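Researcher: We are triaging several targets before committing to wet-lab work. For this one, the compound of interest is flavin mononucleotide. I'm pasting the protein sequence and the ligand SMILES. What I need is the predicted three-dimensional arrangement of the protein with the ligand bound, expressed as structure tokens, so it can go straight into our comparison scripts without reformatting.
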Amino acid sequence: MKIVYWSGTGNTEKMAELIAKGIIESGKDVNTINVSDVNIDELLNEDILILGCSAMGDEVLEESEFEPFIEEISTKISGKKVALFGSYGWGDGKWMRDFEERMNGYGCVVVETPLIVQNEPDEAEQDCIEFGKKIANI
Ligand SMILES: Cc1cc2nc3c(=O)[nH]c(=O)nc-3n(C[C@H](O)[C@H](O)[C@H](O)COP(=O)(O)O)c2cc1C
């Protein structure tokens, strides 16, 4: 499987690692890719797209790299399964409610409830591993 993410300080990156750990513990392989090093062509062959990005700007996806990437793949992902995650700070998840609505609008099937964790995953570490286990079980 593949996990593509954007992280500004490392919080979403850590969530990605823990989610990968859960998939691996389930007996499956998985690669975590920073959005800047992603190959759209190969990514589109995946059964499930695992995407993560922290809450940026005023409750939006990161604008210079992650957002353009979502727009790029938007026309080629209808019917695909997606799992969404990300770290946030002061809000209550508005950027993720919007991200989920958006992916749904592109024709994707959001397999699990988006996983959002405030700041760094410390107390939420197991939740991250469990999210990975749920995904590897689909
Ligand atoms: C420029 C900027 C804008 C932000 N906007 C939001 C926001 O609208 N809502 C929110 O809850 N957190 C917001 N945050 C906080 C980050 O989502 C939060 O610090 C998160 O843990 C960062 O994860 P990262 O290291 O993966 O990027 C913002 C952070 C920055 C730097």
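Researcher: Any quick observations?
Model: The two ends are 12 Å apart (CA to CA).
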